[PDB]
Amino acid sequence: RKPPKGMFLSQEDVEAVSANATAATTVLRQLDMELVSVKRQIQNIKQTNSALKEKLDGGIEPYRLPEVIQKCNARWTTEEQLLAVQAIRKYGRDFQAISDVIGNKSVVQVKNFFVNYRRRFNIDEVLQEWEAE
């Protein structure tokens, strides 16, 4: 009922090789062609990838800046308020970006800021202005 293990006996395959007197060596040669074409492709992409790998030499170490550690203060300096408004204008709703720009404010505090001063800082206008971009 079942072929031996390690033995692969499909209907489609048998009918496919039986058709001709040498459909055997035909299909087998086709497979050899597929095989070699594939390995060629491998060589190719291996070399382009080796080239790209050569470009990235140096990493980004020269361009990495140290990390500011400023604790979150609840009070909003007029400085930090202005930072904020600009940050909105550039980032829109990305509250995280905004928090990182200001540095000593958390995202919740950010949202609060949004709400409280939403009148006085016309934050509506600001957001739509960012949306234009």
Added chain:
Amino acid sequence: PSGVEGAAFQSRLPHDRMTSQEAACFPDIISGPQQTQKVFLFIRNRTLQLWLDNPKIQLTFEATLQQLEAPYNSDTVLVHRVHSYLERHGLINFGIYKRIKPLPTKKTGKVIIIGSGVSGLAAARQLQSFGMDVTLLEARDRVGGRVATFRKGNYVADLGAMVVTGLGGNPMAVVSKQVNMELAKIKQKCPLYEANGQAVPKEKDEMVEQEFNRLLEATSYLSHQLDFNVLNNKPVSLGQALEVVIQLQEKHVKDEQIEHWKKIVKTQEELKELLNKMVNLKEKIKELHQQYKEASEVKPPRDITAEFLVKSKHRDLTALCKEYDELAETQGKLEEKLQELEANPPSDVYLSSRDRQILDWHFANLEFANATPLSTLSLKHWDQDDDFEFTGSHLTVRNGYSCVPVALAEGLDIKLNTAVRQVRYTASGCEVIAVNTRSTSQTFIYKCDAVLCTLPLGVLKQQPPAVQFVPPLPEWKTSAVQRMGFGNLNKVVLCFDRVFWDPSVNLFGHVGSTTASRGELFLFWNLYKAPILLALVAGEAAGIMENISDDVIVGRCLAILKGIFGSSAVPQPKETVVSRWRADPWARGSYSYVAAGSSGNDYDLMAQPITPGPSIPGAPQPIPRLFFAGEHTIRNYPATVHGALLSGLREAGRIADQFLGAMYTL
């Protein structure tokens, strides 16, 4: 089994059932009550048992009944019916037994038996046992036919049959009890030696062997489970089936490799797109960094837009740096995966040259067992006797197998050197025209009631006919004779003066250089006490090697031997013998096989006796005059010796029944 079931087993019979034959002889029993059937069965088994427990003497009905116990010894006519049925079809009192009731004073009916091969001898001994006038016509100057033993001094070696394929249910068991045969076990271990003389490593050995068996099983699965049995309009042979299975293996291998390398490609391309990403990212990070520096240049105090600009670019830059570090992690992962894939590649090939060579040797072994190119065996049916295997280890006859036919020919009327040239069977009897093989003008005529024809299927196959049948065999029997297969197989006896091989090794191989030459001298046997080695030639090679002189052949032999053992170790053979069976005109081959397009059914056709047309027109359809026996006739055990012998016993029973009458069927 053991007990009376043991006997029923030993006699190739189901201890708990009535066979079709027994049904025919005893239709009152089977159609009747189960109880009685069981009685019958026990009577049969117990008689069997008796004979078997001592087959050196005749088992008379009186004796049988005397040793029977109640209630089984009540219905004495049943006991008698049974005893006779058994005696008749030689399930008992067959072979060579001291006759209790001395042979009948005056004979009855006349039977001419063509050929004193084993089937022949067996039947003849039975027919004589039953009191007919039997006479045998052997073309040769010796008995046995395809049981042939070379002897010179103490050198003794079978060019014919040689192996007893197991004793469980083998009549030959009985015969051996009757005849002094030095039987010896066959140590199954068989080393292989590539063309060079280097032994094949156990790794290789077992791997190949296993893949072989798996291939076979594969073909079988192809055959029965898939009904792969007719490619073109031609039937399919084992050969083609194996070839296909193999080609599918190679193809599958290629598929595996391709899938794998393609996985690797896909991954490589992922890596590519990744790298591109990372590079553009580093560019953006470079430019950002620059801009941040330029914004840091603007020294404080600064209005808030400026401060926002520095803070901004710093945020953005730390961001892109983050992103890039992630991408670098991902690159790490892709790279190690690619090392994994590139580290685990599927098998390079399906079969190497050494592999395919050893495989070829296993195939040569197969072609040897069946004595024919696997291209010829019937895919479906080539293994149909397989379900009747004897149990036990296969043995060899140390003192030459011929010791048996000879022993069978004691007391028989045999005419050696008599080639039968024509068989004439008529409504009123038969006449058989034969010539003296020595002086082929010296003619003989033999007239008789019936003619039992143990002519080798090859001889029957001959064109133009070695033996003429008048009137001609009918279309159905001829066609059966054309469809069947007769194979070829030869042996080379090498007689040296001292043992230079492994005396604990019974058989060892030699792997053929090519596919074509895989049969060519592929196997050796040390079975004899004497320094005698036996080389085999099978397959395609067996037919071609017959057109080559002895000396050349023994040449190639000693060559391979030297290659395996060393040039300063292989003496010249004091005596050398080479069989050519396909040449032998009293054989025309080795034994039969189930050619593609043939089946077992044709073995049955070969057995069916012939009934001649009526002399006077409008006369009753006669008695059957022409009977066939022999190895090619017995569906469940062809190409053997036990096979022959049984066919002989069978026909003798049939013939006797026909002319002396069966009194046990009432």
Added chain:
Amino acid sequence: XXXXAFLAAX
């Protein structure tokens, strides 16, 4: 072996 037992016809 296989088939086959040992040295049979098949």
